[PDB]
């Protein structure tokens, strides 16, 4: 369950050392930070701890995929300690490791108010439990070593806080291996739990899911689970052409087509009919002569077909209208996946227009939840983060929740 978890607001931190797992996996260009959003996002949990009299806050995270080898020239967290000091108005001590005797001593009984940032957890194979050696071979971590790694992390605080939703789908040492009596979700995780519980357990009605993406076959469990919960579903993006080819015999040109997904389209429509779910597919398209930002563009409908050579890379104006009609009926919306190639301006109108409708919906009291990854990227690109109810901080984690799975990092949190 998402509803029965201990959170930071209910956790007594006064005089306690707080070991906190954060998401500082920020985008980099040669170990310099291009977007600090994820660092700003953790600040409320850190300041709460400091303001409520925590003895220390020890921050642990990963960055990139070092795959269990130390790579401090390429994937060090050191630049984050500088960024964090800017954002907190407080000195941040950066340590060049995250476990072992020197780190445990630094963290044993620090001065009241101390903020410490540890080096990349994924420099140790014991964090993910497997990785690659410098020859590129697979290695798995050894049990006794995983135990020692976990025990060393657990020394660094008296209580544990997880504010890294983006890793909560992974049974990694920092997510599930910290052995302290109280394990609480921080304020980012609290928001994720609150919104996705509402969504998956007791949504407002009508509940609309907006699903986009390239393939059908890798989204079958997502679609199937959402068909158990929703009243309406928009299917957009590249995956729509598989549905349209199968159901209408549409000529789709060089548009994405999922041969294995094609074999289950009617099975999905069948379940939608059985559950009384209204499916809204697109009816018109912006076409491209190739998969390129500066492609020549055209227009098509289902009735016209797409010319051979050409591909549908966005929905068209009548599709936007049908999509807006479903948004207008909704009292709750989950949106996972853009409805066209939003990275390229010529193919971004459908996604921007739908975002405008979703913002207007929120204004009139719709609960609007944006999945992590590409849909969240659109909100940042068009500055709509504060104009929807919730923008999830974890792509892979939000997708696994929406598929109906239990997240090992959430499960590891204390109950009540």
Ligand X SMILES: Nc1ncnc2c1ncn2[C@@H]1O[C@H](COP(=O)(O)OP(=O)(O)O)[C@@H](O)[C@H]1O
> Looking at the annotation, which residues are catalytic?
38, 215, 373, 396
By CB under 5 A, is residue 215 in contact with Mg ion?
yes
**Residue for token pair 């850190």:** 46
Rg for the chain, CA atoms, rounded:
23
As measured in angstroms, the least distance from the Cβ of 68 to ligand X is 25
By CB under 5 A, is residue 217 in contact with Mg ion?
no
**Six token digits for residue 260:** 């294995």
| Cβ(84)–Cβ(117) below 8 Å | yes
Q: Which residues pair with 33 in a beta bridge?
A: 28
Residue 350 known to bind ligand: no
Q: How many residues bind Mg ion (CB under 5 A)?
A: 4
By beta-carbon proximity to Mg ion, the closer residue of 11 and 223 is 223
CA distance 226 to 67: 34
By CB under 5 A, is residue 214 in contact with Mg ion?
yes
CA distance 152 to 329: 53
| Cβ(35)–Cβ(377) below 8 Å | no
Which of these ranges, 215-223, 255-263, 315-323, 397-405, lies near Mg ion under the rule CB under 5 A?
A: 215-223
Residue 312 known to bind ligand: yes
Residue 99 known to bind ligand: no
Task: List contacts with ligand X (CB under 6 A).
Answer: 213-215, 237-238, 256, 312-313, 337-338, 340-343, 373-374
CA distance 313 to 311: 6
Q: Which residues pair with 288 in a beta bridge?
A: 297, 311
As measured in angstroms, the least distance from the Cβ of 252 to ligand X is 10
As measured in angstroms, the least distance from the Cβ of 342 to ligand X is 6
Residue 23 known to bind ligand: yes
By beta-carbon proximity to ligand X, the closer residue of 131 and 337 is 337
**Residue for token pair 């996946």:** 337
State the DSSP string of 240-302. HHHHHHHHH----TTS---HHHHTTHHHHHHHHHHHTPEEE---EEEEESSSSTT--EEEEET
Find, among 22, 25, 43, the residue nearest to 34 by Cα.
25
Q: Which one of ligand X, Mg ion, none interacts with residue 256, CB within 5 to 8 A by kind? A: ligand X
Which of these ranges, 168-176, 335-343, 392-400, 403-411, lies near Mg ion under the rule CB under 5 A?
A: 335-343
CA distance 193 to 243: 32
| Cβ(52)–Cβ(13) below 8 Å | yes
By CB under 5 A, is residue 238 in contact with Mg ion?
no
Residue 390 known to bind ligand: no
Q: For strand 297-301 and strand 284-288, is the pairing parallel, antiparallel, or unpaired? A: antiparallel
Residue 61 known to bind ligand: yes
By beta-carbon proximity to Mg ion, the closer residue of 63 and 401 is 401
As measured in angstroms, the least distance from the Cβ of 351 to ligand X is 8
CA distance 123 to 98: 9
By beta-carbon proximity to ligand X, the closer residue of 311 and 330 is 311
By beta-carbon proximity to ligand X, the closer residue of 119 and 192 is 192
By beta-carbon proximity to ligand X, the closer residue of 129 and 312 is 312
Q: Tell which one of 129, 157, 186, 337 touches Mg ion (CB under 5 A).
A: 337
CA distance 240 to 282: 7
Please give the torsion angle defined by the CA atoms of residues 416, 118, 165 and 49, in that order, rounded to the nearest 10 degrees.
40
As measured in angstroms, the least distance from the Cβ of 65 to ligand X is 17
Q: Tell which one of 66, 203, 213, 409 touches Mg ion (CB under 5 A).
A: 213
As measured in angstroms, the least distance from the Cβ of 179 to ligand X is 34
Residue 258 known to bind ligand: no
The reply to whether omega before 206 is within 30° of 0 (cis) is: yes
Q: Which one of Mg ion, ligand X, none interacts with residue 196, CB within 5 to 8 A by kind? A: none
Binding site for AMP: which residues?
Answer: 214-215, 219, 238, 312, 343
Binding site for (2R)-3-phosphoglycerate: which residues?
Answer: 22-25, 37-38, 61-62, 64-65, 121-122, 169-170
Binding site for ADP: which residues?
Answer: 213, 237, 342
Residues that bind Mg ion (CB under 5 A): 213-215, 337
């Amino acid at each position: 369950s998402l509803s029965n978890k201990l959170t930071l607001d209910k956790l007594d931190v006064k005089g306690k050392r707080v070991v906190m797992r954060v998401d500082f996996n920020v985008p980099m260009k040669n170990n310099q930070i291009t977007n600090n959003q994820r660092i700003k996002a953790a600040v409320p949990s850190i300041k709460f701890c400091l303001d409520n009299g925590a003895k220390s806050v020890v921050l642990m995270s990963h960055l990139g995929r070092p795959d269990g080898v130390p790579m401090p020239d390429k994937y060090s967290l050191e630049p984050v300690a500088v960024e964090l000091k800017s954002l907190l108005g407080k000195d941040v001590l950066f340590l060049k490791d995250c476990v072992g005797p020197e780190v445990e001593k630094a963290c044993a009984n620090p001065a009241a108010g101390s903020v410490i940032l540890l080096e990349n957890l994924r420099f140790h194979v014991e964090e993910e439990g497997k990785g690659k050696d410098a020859s590129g071979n697979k290695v798995k971590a050894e049990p006794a070593k995983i135990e020692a790694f976990r025990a060393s992390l657990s020394k660094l605080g008296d209580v544990y806080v997880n504010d890294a939703f983006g890793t909560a789908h992974r049974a990694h040492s920092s997510m599930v291996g910290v052995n302290l009596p109280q394990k609480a979700g921080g304020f980012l995780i609290k928001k994720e739990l609150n919104y996705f519980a509402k969504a998956l357990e007791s949504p407002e009605r009508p509940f609309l899911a907006i699903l986009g993406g390239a393939k059908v076959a890798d989204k079958i469990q997502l679609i199937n689970n959402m068909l158990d919960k929703v009243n309406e579903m928009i299917i957009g993006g590249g995956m729509a052409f598989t549905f349209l080819k199968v159901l209408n015999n549409m000529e789709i040109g060089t548009s994405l087509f999922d041969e294995e997904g094609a074999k289950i389209v009617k099975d999905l429509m069948s379940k939608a009919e059985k559950n009384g779910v209204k499916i809204t597919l697109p009816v018109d398209f912006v076409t491209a002569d190739k998969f390129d930002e500066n492609a020549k563009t055209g227009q098509a409908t289902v009735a016209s077909g797409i010319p051979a050579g050409w591909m549908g890379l966005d929905c068209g104006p009548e599709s936007s209208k049908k999509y807006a009609e479903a948004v207008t009926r909704a009292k709750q919306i989950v949106w996972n996946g853009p409805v066209g190639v939003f990275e390229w301006e010529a193919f971004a109108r459908g996604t921007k227009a739908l975002m405008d409708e979703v913002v207007k919906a929120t204004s009139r009291g719709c609960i609007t939840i944006i999945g992590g990854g590409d849909t969240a990227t659109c909100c940042a690109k068009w500055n709509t983060e504060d104009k929807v109810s919730h923008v999830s901080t974890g792509g892979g984690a939000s997708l696994e929740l929406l598929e109906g799975k239990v997240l090992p990092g959430v499960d590891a949190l204390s109950n009540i």
